[PDB]
Swiss-Prot record, chain B:
It comes from the Viruses. This is Spike protein S2'. The gene is S. Changing residue 27 to K: In strain: Omicron/BA.1, Omicron/BA.2, Omicron/BA.2.12.1, Omicron/BA.2.75, Omicron/BA.4, Omicron/BA.5, Omicron/BQ.1.1, Omicron/XBB.1.5, Omicron/EG.5.1. Subunit of the fusion protein that is processed upon entry into the host cell. Mediates fusion of the virion and cellular membranes by functioning as a class I viral fusion protein. Contains a viral fusion peptide that is unmasked after S2 cleavage. This cleavage can occur at the cell membrane by host TMPRSS2 or during endocytosis by host CSTL. In either case, this triggers an extensive and irreversible conformational change that leads to fusion of the viral envelope with the cellular cytoplasmic membrane, releasing viral genomic RNA into the host cell cytoplasm. It comes from Severe acute respiratory syndrome coronavirus 2 (2019-nCoV). Residues 7-49 form a coiled coil.
Amino acid sequence: ASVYAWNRKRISNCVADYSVLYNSASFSTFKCYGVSPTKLNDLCFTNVYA
Amino acid sequence: SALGKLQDVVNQNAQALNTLVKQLSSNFGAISSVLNDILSRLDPPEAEV
């Protein structure tokens, strides 16, 4: 969808391994604010949104 | 309430300790007031500030 109608998916009951996303050589910009790009598997989030 | 000065000194010490404990749990303009969660979330180069 476009920016005026950006979707929002409330993802829960999820098992996230962000190491495969960061180590993909496909993402140009990975400005990861608030939390470090690495050392992310040692966290356990309440609820995420995409 | 006959002993007023001693009780006042004890209450002042207790209030000082309580204010110190409350300031321990303050953010001071940061992401959180704890250090272990900051170290686990952020990396040292960006969490140093």
